[PDB]
Amino acid sequence: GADGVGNASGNWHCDSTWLGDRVITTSTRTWALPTYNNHLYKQISSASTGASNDNHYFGYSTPWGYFDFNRFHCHFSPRDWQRLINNNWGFRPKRLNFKLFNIQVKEVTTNDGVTTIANNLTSTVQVFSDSEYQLPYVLGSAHQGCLPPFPADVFMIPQYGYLTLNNGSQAVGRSSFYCLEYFPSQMLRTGNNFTFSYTFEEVPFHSSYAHSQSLDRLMNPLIDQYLYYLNRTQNQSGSAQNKDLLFSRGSPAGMSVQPKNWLPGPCYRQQRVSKTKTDNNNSNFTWTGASKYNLNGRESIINPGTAMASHKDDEDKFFPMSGVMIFGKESAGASNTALDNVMITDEEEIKATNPVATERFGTVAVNFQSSSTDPATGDVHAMGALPGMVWQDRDVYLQGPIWAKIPHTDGHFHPSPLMGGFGLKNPPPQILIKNTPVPANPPAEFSATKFASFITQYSTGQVSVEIEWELQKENSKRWNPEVQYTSNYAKSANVDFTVDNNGLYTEPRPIGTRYLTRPL
């Protein structure tokens, strides 16, 4: 860093600047970091517990905390998101600037049942960015502890832990252990500060638009095709039914039978469930009726799974059991909370190109028809990629994640993070931070045994993240007005995206980005 006890090492830079094709978000917050695990690394696992085989794990927990800004509301105020989404066909991150500063380390002494805090001026906090990605990448799993949406909220830094290979609750020889200290890290006293910058790789702009055409309506509703298709295998009222081969040319009255160039996207069917409970089966079918994948004898719910439309027209009451992103309200309990404490996303806009999530992809022949054998077909519920398929990826949300690390594998296929966002080979590095252990008084006589008595402390300061975002401007010739995200004009007891009478900021709904429209 820096300088004095008596001298701030950073100012408060929270702002938005719009500049034609760029928008620069700056956000600064005040954090608090406790001591974790008493400065220990612990082995952790599902041993005992009583966990099922699909829940076993092995890993470690760490004395470190970390910074996480991997949520859009860490950077975009509600109004800015609104600006973003109502005027642009897309956007992407380009560069970032990160700042830790104004650090202040404090000691806690308890006597009684009356707790005193003071400054420990000569104490440090340690920091580093894992810029060579040598640590297990724990961002992009949508874990809580990101910078809060509301700039006035103070936040506690999450603790870093990670998993490795496990065979049940045991480890394997291949399992990996990381000690964080065995990086180089920067050591900061109250005077000092930390900074680094980062550039994002080139990535496709996120599609902030719905289509205003669908795959099956790309033709000109005024002209025939020059192409023919088999229309009838029997006449044709000449009594009664006689084998025939009758061919018709593509025609505006038969848009369902016209040859075309393209196929809709992939499909992994999911179970349709209603918001009115009375429609559903009387059982507990989530695990048992769930779409799951099977990995080394362990089952995992596919969630949210392939980008698919949530419901066809007029059926907004249904949703895939595990195919929509779902946010909790600020009233929601951790487990088995009710419908009205959650907010379910809707990905209905993609039904122009993407199969609906709770229906078949389609139908396939399954035999050879003949006079003796009747033509049979079967339903296709899971369809991989076929040449000619086109699709739309899952939408992002003001409160969803931004990016994830693409796994380091021989093979990916369209590695856009299924929960939504940008896939990055070389994503924003993890930023780790810890209070340096400060021994309590040692004995008068040497002892070799692990030092286990420490002065209790924690730290606080500010953090600042600045991101530059490039915009894809809208160039639309559409004559009529667009759907636009808008707040509600009718009167009410509270304003949306505001604090209440107890000062609790709330986000009353998810907001996606798909309001403007393109042609296909």
Ligand X SMILES: Nc1ccnc(=O)[nH]1
What is the binding site for ligand ADE (CB under 6 A)?
Answer: 203-204, 414-416, 422-423
Q: Which does 50 bind (CB under 5 to 8 A by kind): ligand X, ligand ADE, its own copies, none?
A: none
**Cα 472 → chain centroid:** 22
Task: Report in angstroms how near the CB of residue 416 gets to ligand X at its nearest.
Answer: 8
Neighbours of 330 (CB within 10 A): 11
Considering only the stretches 45-53, 91-99, 195-203, report the one whose residues sit in contact with its own copies under the rule CB under 8 A: 45-53
If one asks whether residue 32 binds its own copies (CB under 8 A), the answer comes out as yes
Q: Confirm or reject binding of residue 472 to its own copies (CB under 8 A).
A: no
Select the binding partner of residue 383 from ligand ADE, ligand X, its own copies, none (C-beta < 5 to 8 A, by kind).
its own copies
Q: Which one of 74, 215, 467, 471 is in contact with its own copies (CB under 8 A)?
A: 215
Site membership for its own copies, residue 508 (CB under 8 A): no
- Total residues in contact with its own copies, by rule CB under 8 A: 347
CB closer to ligand ADE out of 78 and 415: 415
Q: Which is closer to its own copies, CB of 166 or CB of 200? A: 166
Pull the structure tokens for residue 231: 């229309």
Q: How far apart are CA 465 and CA 410, in angstroms?
A: 33
3-state DSSP assignment of residue 342: strand
CB of 407 to ligand X, least distance (A): 11
Encoded tokens for 462: 């500010």
Among 299, 346, 470, 472, binds its own copies (CB under 8 A): 299
| Binders of its own copies in range 222-261 (CB under 8 A) | 222-234, 236, 241-251, 253-261
Kindly state the smallest distance separating residue 256's Cβ from its own copies, in Å.
Answer: 4
Contacts of 149 (CB under 8 A, 6+ apart): 71, 73, 74, 399, 505, 507
| 411 touches ligand X by CB under 6 A | yes
Residue 216, Ramachandran bin (φ over 0: left; ψ between -120 and 50: alpha; else beta): alpha
Q: ∠ at Cα 40 (38, 45), nearest 5°?
A: 115
Q: How far is the CB of 91 from ligand ADE (least distance, A)?
A: 12
Task: By CB under 6 A, tell whether 412 contacts ligand X.
Answer: yes
Query: Please, which of residues 340-369 interact with ligand X by CB under 6 A?
Result: none
DSSP state, 439?
B
Q: Does 414 bind ligand X (CB under 6 A)?
A: yes
- Of 412 and 509, nearer to ligand X (C-beta) is 412
- For 71, 433, 505, the CA distances from 68, given in Å and listed in that order, are 8, 12, 20
State the minimum distance, in angstroms, from the CB of residue 196 to its own copies. Answer: 14
Q: How far is the CB of 12 from its own copies (least distance, A)?
A: 4
* Residue pair 259/217 in contact by the 8 Å Cβ criterion: no
* Peptide bond preceding 304 in cis form (omega within 30 of 0): yes
Among 202, 238, 239, 374, binds its own copies (CB under 8 A): 374
Classified as helix, coil or strand, 256 is coil
Contact 140, 404 (CB under 8 A): yes
Decide if residue 425 touches ligand X (CB under 6 A): no
The residue within the footprint of its own copies, chosen from 196, 326, 346, 426 (CB under 8 A), is 326
Q: How far apart are CA 77 and CA 401, in angstroms?
A: 15
- Taking the complex as a whole, how short is the minimal distance between the CB of residue 401 and ligand ADE, in angstroms? 12
Nearest CA to 320 out of 362, 354, 282 is that of: 354
Pick between residue 133 and residue 196 the one whose CB is nearest to its own copies.
133
Q: Are 403 and 421 in contact (CB under 8 A)?
A: yes
Residues 329-358 touching its own copies, rule: CB under 8 A, are 332, 334-339, 341-342, 351-353, 355-356, 358
Q: Which is nearer to ligand X, 42 or 412 (CB)?
A: 412
Q: How far is CA 344 from CA 52, 239, 316, 321, 419, in A?
A: 28, 56, 11, 11, 14
Chain centroid to CA 309: how far? 17
